[PDB]
């Protein structure tokens, strides 16, 4: 299995994910 494999697609899309999450707390500090 090796879930190890998993995380390696993680660090690219956590990079893009990051924008993402913080557009919401954006809407939360109006």
Do not use: E, P, Q, R
């Amino acid at each position: 299995s090796n879930k190890g494999a998993i995380i390696g697609l993680m660090v690219g899309g956590v990079v893009i994910a990051t924008m993402i999450v913080i557009t919401l707390v954006m809407l939360k500090k109006k």
